Design an enzyme around this catalytic site. Structure first.
Site, PDB file in Angstrom:
ATOM      1  N   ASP A  43     -35.453 -16.870 -63.235  1.00 49.60           N
ATOM      2  CA  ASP A  43     -34.455 -17.121 -62.198  1.00 49.60           C
ATOM      3  C   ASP A  43     -33.048 -17.197 -62.802  1.00 49.60           C
ATOM      4  O   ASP A  43     -32.779 -18.060 -63.640  1.00 49.60           O
ATOM      5  CB  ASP A  43     -34.772 -18.419 -61.449  1.00 49.60           C
ATOM      6  CG  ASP A  43     -33.845 -18.647 -60.273  1.00 49.60           C
ATOM      7  OD1 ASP A  43     -33.002 -19.557 -60.325  1.00 49.60           O
ATOM      8  OD2 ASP A  43     -33.922 -17.876 -59.311  1.00 49.60           O
ATOM      9  N   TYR A  48     -24.084 -19.277 -63.492  1.00 49.56           N
ATOM     10  CA  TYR A  48     -24.639 -20.044 -64.607  1.00 49.56           C
ATOM     11  C   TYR A  48     -23.978 -19.681 -65.938  1.00 49.56           C
ATOM     12  O   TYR A  48     -24.098 -20.431 -66.903  1.00 49.56           O
ATOM     13  CB  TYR A  48     -26.161 -19.847 -64.709  1.00 49.56           C
ATOM     14  CG  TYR A  48     -26.975 -20.293 -63.505  1.00 49.56           C
ATOM     15  CD1 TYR A  48     -26.444 -21.152 -62.538  1.00 49.56           C
ATOM     16  CD2 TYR A  48     -28.292 -19.843 -63.325  1.00 49.56           C
ATOM     17  CE1 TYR A  48     -27.194 -21.548 -61.422  1.00 49.56           C
ATOM     18  CE2 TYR A  48     -29.049 -20.229 -62.212  1.00 49.56           C
ATOM     19  CZ  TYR A  48     -28.494 -21.080 -61.261  1.00 49.56           C
ATOM     20  OH  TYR A  48     -29.218 -21.450 -60.147  1.00 49.56           O
ATOM     21  N   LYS A  77     -28.390 -14.041 -58.154  1.00 47.31           N
ATOM     22  CA  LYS A  77     -27.801 -14.572 -56.932  1.00 47.31           C
ATOM     23  C   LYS A  77     -26.316 -14.246 -56.796  1.00 47.31           C
ATOM     24  O   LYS A  77     -25.548 -14.363 -57.760  1.00 47.31           O
ATOM     25  CB  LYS A  77     -27.998 -16.094 -56.864  1.00 47.31           C
ATOM     26  CG  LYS A  77     -29.418 -16.581 -57.111  1.00 47.31           C
ATOM     27  CD  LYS A  77     -29.499 -18.091 -57.063  1.00 47.31           C
ATOM     28  CE  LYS A  77     -30.797 -18.598 -57.656  1.00 47.31           C
ATOM     29  NZ  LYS A  77     -30.676 -18.842 -59.107  1.00 47.31           N
ATOM     30  N   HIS A 110     -26.493 -16.928 -52.759  1.00 53.54           N
ATOM     31  CA  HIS A 110     -26.672 -18.214 -53.421  1.00 53.54           C
ATOM     32  C   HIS A 110     -26.489 -19.397 -52.469  1.00 53.54           C
ATOM     33  O   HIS A 110     -27.259 -20.357 -52.512  1.00 53.54           O
ATOM     34  CB  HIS A 110     -25.691 -18.334 -54.593  1.00 53.54           C
ATOM     35  CG  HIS A 110     -26.181 -19.188 -55.725  1.00 53.54           C
ATOM     36  ND1 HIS A 110     -25.814 -18.965 -57.031  1.00 53.54           N
ATOM     37  CD2 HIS A 110     -26.910 -20.326 -55.731  1.00 53.54           C
ATOM     38  CE1 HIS A 110     -26.277 -19.937 -57.792  1.00 53.54           C
ATOM     39  NE2 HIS A 110     -26.948 -20.781 -57.029  1.00 53.54           N
TER      40      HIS A 110
HETATM   41  N1  LIG Z   1     -30.580 -21.802 -55.546  1.00 53.18           N
HETATM   42  C1  LIG Z   1     -29.758 -22.771 -55.955  1.00 53.18           C
HETATM   43  O1  LIG Z   1     -28.784 -23.176 -55.316  1.00 53.18           O
HETATM   44  C2  LIG Z   1     -30.242 -23.480 -57.220  1.00 53.18           C
HETATM   45  C3  LIG Z   1     -29.780 -24.777 -57.470  1.00 53.18           C
HETATM   46  C4  LIG Z   1     -30.343 -25.559 -58.469  1.00 53.18           C
HETATM   47  C5  LIG Z   1     -31.378 -25.025 -59.235  1.00 53.18           C
HETATM   48  N2  LIG Z   1     -31.818 -23.691 -59.052  1.00 53.18           N
HETATM   49  C6  LIG Z   1     -32.791 -23.054 -59.975  1.00 53.18           C
HETATM   50  O2  LIG Z   1     -33.933 -23.877 -60.209  1.00 53.18           O
HETATM   51  C7  LIG Z   1     -34.006 -24.140 -61.613  1.00 53.18           C
HETATM   52  C8  LIG Z   1     -34.732 -25.446 -61.881  1.00 53.18           C
HETATM   53  O3  LIG Z   1     -34.052 -26.582 -61.337  1.00 53.18           O
HETATM   54  P1  LIG Z   1     -33.043 -27.481 -62.225  1.00 53.18           P
HETATM   55  O4  LIG Z   1     -32.578 -26.738 -63.408  1.00 53.18           O
HETATM   56  O5  LIG Z   1     -32.059 -28.121 -61.351  1.00 53.18           O
HETATM   57  O6  LIG Z   1     -33.973 -28.685 -62.718  1.00 53.18           O
HETATM   58  P2  LIG Z   1     -35.488 -28.961 -63.134  1.00 53.18           P
HETATM   59  O7  LIG Z   1     -36.219 -27.720 -63.407  1.00 53.18           O
HETATM   60  O8  LIG Z   1     -35.981 -29.800 -62.046  1.00 53.18           O
HETATM   61  O9  LIG Z   1     -35.373 -29.822 -64.480  1.00 53.18           O
HETATM   62  C9  LIG Z   1     -34.776 -29.386 -65.702  1.00 53.18           C
HETATM   63  C10 LIG Z   1     -34.760 -30.588 -66.636  1.00 53.18           C
HETATM   64  O10 LIG Z   1     -36.086 -31.136 -66.856  1.00 53.18           O
HETATM   65  C11 LIG Z   1     -36.387 -31.140 -68.268  1.00 53.18           C
HETATM   66  N3  LIG Z   1     -37.837 -30.832 -68.416  1.00 53.18           N
HETATM   67  C12 LIG Z   1     -38.416 -29.616 -68.352  1.00 53.18           C
HETATM   68  N4  LIG Z   1     -39.728 -29.688 -68.578  1.00 53.18           N
HETATM   69  C13 LIG Z   1     -39.947 -30.980 -68.781  1.00 53.18           C
HETATM   70  C14 LIG Z   1     -41.147 -31.543 -69.228  1.00 53.18           C
HETATM   71  N5  LIG Z   1     -42.295 -30.876 -69.273  1.00 53.18           N
HETATM   72  N6  LIG Z   1     -41.094 -32.856 -69.552  1.00 53.18           N
HETATM   73  C15 LIG Z   1     -39.976 -33.574 -69.443  1.00 53.18           C
HETATM   74  N7  LIG Z   1     -38.840 -33.020 -69.014  1.00 53.18           N
HETATM   75  C16 LIG Z   1     -38.786 -31.719 -68.690  1.00 53.18           C
HETATM   76  C17 LIG Z   1     -35.455 -30.097 -68.869  1.00 53.18           C
HETATM   77  O11 LIG Z   1     -35.081 -30.434 -70.202  1.00 53.18           O
HETATM   78  P3  LIG Z   1     -35.065 -29.360 -71.385  1.00 53.18           P
HETATM   79  O12 LIG Z   1     -34.428 -28.170 -70.793  1.00 53.18           O
HETATM   80  O13 LIG Z   1     -34.221 -30.128 -72.312  1.00 53.18           O
HETATM   81  O14 LIG Z   1     -36.473 -29.222 -71.801  1.00 53.18           O
HETATM   82  C18 LIG Z   1     -34.230 -30.266 -68.002  1.00 53.18           C
HETATM   83  O15 LIG Z   1     -33.520 -31.397 -68.480  1.00 53.18           O
HETATM   84  C19 LIG Z   1     -32.576 -24.026 -62.131  1.00 53.18           C
HETATM   85  O16 LIG Z   1     -32.429 -23.813 -63.534  1.00 53.18           O
HETATM   86  C20 LIG Z   1     -32.207 -22.775 -61.358  1.00 53.18           C
HETATM   87  O17 LIG Z   1     -32.872 -21.672 -61.960  1.00 53.18           O
HETATM   88  C21 LIG Z   1     -31.244 -22.929 -58.030  1.00 53.18           C
HETATM   89  O1  LIG Z   2     -26.395 -23.764 -56.953  1.00 53.10           O
HETATM   90  C1  LIG Z   2     -26.914 -23.818 -58.090  1.00 53.10           C
HETATM   91  O2  LIG Z   2     -27.809 -23.044 -58.463  1.00 53.10           O
HETATM   92  C2  LIG Z   2     -26.466 -24.895 -59.052  1.00 53.10           C
HETATM   93  C3  LIG Z   2     -25.009 -24.787 -59.411  1.00 53.10           C
HETATM   94  C4  LIG Z   2     -24.601 -24.135 -60.572  1.00 53.10           C
HETATM   95  C5  LIG Z   2     -23.238 -24.069 -60.912  1.00 53.10           C
HETATM   96  C6  LIG Z   2     -22.289 -24.666 -60.077  1.00 53.10           C
HETATM   97  C7  LIG Z   2     -22.709 -25.325 -58.914  1.00 53.10           C
HETATM   98  C8  LIG Z   2     -24.062 -25.387 -58.581  1.00 53.10           C
HETATM   99  O3  LIG Z   2     -24.462 -26.051 -57.434  1.00 53.10           O
END
Ligand SMILES: NC(=O)c1ccc[n+]([C@@H]2O[C@H](COP(=O)([O-])OP(=O)(O)OC[C@H]3O[C@@H](n4cnc5c(N)ncnc54)[C@H](OP(=O)(O)O)[C@@H]3O)[C@@H](O)[C@H]2O)c1
Ligand SMILES: O=C(O)Cc1ccccc1O
Length: 315
Positions: A43, A48, A77, A110
């Site tokens: 993703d 980013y 996105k 996005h």
């Molecule tokens: N569509 C949108 O508007 C949008 C918005 C937000 C997110 N997203 C997407 O969704 C993805 C995932 O969500 P997110 O990045 O917000 O958060 P997340 O996946 O919920 O959590 C990431 C965090 O959890 C830690 N982690 C990972 N595996 C773990 C494990 N097994 N044990 C303990 N801790 C763990 C990671 O640390 P380390 O990396 O240090 O291991 C990092 O600090 C984003 O990267 C992005 O691709 C999209």
């Molecule tokens: O929407 C996402 O995926 C997360 C993100 C990334 C960078 C800036 C703002 C923001 O909400």
């Protein structure tokens, strides 16, 4: 391997690797390890600021014969400053060149909110608030549709759209392509049962982001809730001989959602993959759903007054 069927006939890997907050000097290695471990879904997004370095990893695994391009499912996105008609193709091509591919598998809008075009991702005025574009969701969608006709993307979708905004697209005069996917925030503290039931009834696949509650979001406070340390979820994990993270990644999978946890840590990337070999009971599932608090990680609080802000409606 398993995978969900999209309304364009393609198959999407139910597990993927997220890359928001993954530093440019760690993410190439993180994506290389993911692909080795068996991830076939990455993703991405322009906003980013690391799509070049994700691209370096993907190209290296393609050269190495580890995967062929058709095995991978790459998502990016369209950012809010690129919503205008004549800018959508340019934004898609910059992402394609940074990732070094000639097509994306899925391209999302996005956020439903359009900002004023420019170099700044969140453009401000002299008062300090976000400047909106006068564009709307339906015109941006028509622009995304012509990317399919031009061969740059195989499927198109949306992200952070509420049910009324998805409705607007489904009822659009001359609709050529239905949204394949709505990517929304989803975890035990924000279960999204109404928006998920609505999307799934119309044949739109749901992707769950921030499944572990996003402990590394730069706006984190000490008194905010922590999914990973919740004793009640610790108890369910212990019963299955799994980690809390593994339980939180399994939970959306049994609701027929795609899930995309982020990690740059090779041992956590591996841990997050070992989720296909156990089942949460219907009791475990219903218990995890009961933990709903309606708490958002990603609320886009600077755009609360935007005409297209998604989170004023119930779902
Ligand atoms: N569509 C949108 O508007 C949008 C918005 C937000 C997110 N997203 C997407 O969704 C993805 C995932 O969500 P997110 O990045 O917000 O958060 P997340 O996946 O919920 O959590 C990431 C965090 O959890 C830690 N982690 C990972 N595996 C773990 C494990 N097994 N044990 C303990 N801790 C763990 C990671 O640390 P380390 O990396 O240090 O291991 C990092 O600090 C984003 O990267 C992005 O691709 C999209
Ligand atoms: O929407 C996402 O995926 C997360 C993100 C990334 C960078 C800036 C703002 C923001 O909400």
């Amino acid at each position: 391997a398993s995978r969900l069927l999209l309304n364009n006939g393609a198959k999407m890997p139910i597990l993927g690797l997220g890359t928001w907050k993954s530093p440019p000097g760690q993410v190439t290695e993180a994506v290389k390890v993911a692909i080795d471990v068996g991830y076939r879904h990455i993703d991405c997004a322009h906003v980013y600021q690391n799509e070049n370095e994700v691209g370096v990893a993907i190209q290296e695994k393609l050269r190495e014969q580890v995967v062929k391009r058709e095995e991978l499912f790459i998502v990016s996105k369209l950012w809010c400053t690129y919503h205008e008609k004549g800018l959508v193709k340019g934004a898609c091509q910059k992402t394609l060149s940074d990732l070094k591919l000639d097509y994306l598998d899925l391209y999302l809008i996005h956020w439903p909110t359009g900002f004023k075009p420019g170099k700044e991702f969140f453009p401000l005025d002299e008062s300090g608030n976000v400047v909106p574009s006068d564009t709307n969701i339906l015109d941006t969608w028509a622009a995304m549709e012509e990317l399919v006709d031009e061969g740059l993307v195989k499927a198109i979708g949306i992200s952070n759209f509420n049910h009324l905004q998805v409705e607007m697209i489904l009822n659009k005069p001359g609709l050529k392509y239905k949204p394949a996917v709505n990517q929304i925030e989803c975890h035990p503290y924000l279960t999204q049962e109404k928006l998920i039931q609505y999307c799934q009834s119309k044949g739109i696949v749901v992707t769950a982001y921030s499944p572990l509650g996003s402990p590394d979001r730069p706006w984190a406070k000490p008194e905010d809730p922590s999914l990973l340390e919740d004793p009640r979820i610790k108890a369910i994990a212990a019963k299955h001989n799994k980690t809390t993270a593994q339980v939180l990644i399994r939970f959306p999978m049994q609701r027929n959602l795609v899930v995309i946890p982020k990690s740059v840590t090779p041992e956590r990337i591996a841990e997050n993959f070992k989720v296909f070999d156990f089942e949460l009971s219907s009791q475990d599932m219903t218990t995890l759903l009961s933990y709903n608090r309606n708490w958002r990680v990603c609320a886009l609080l600077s755009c609360t007054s935007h005409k297209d802000y998604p989170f004023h409606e119930e779902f």
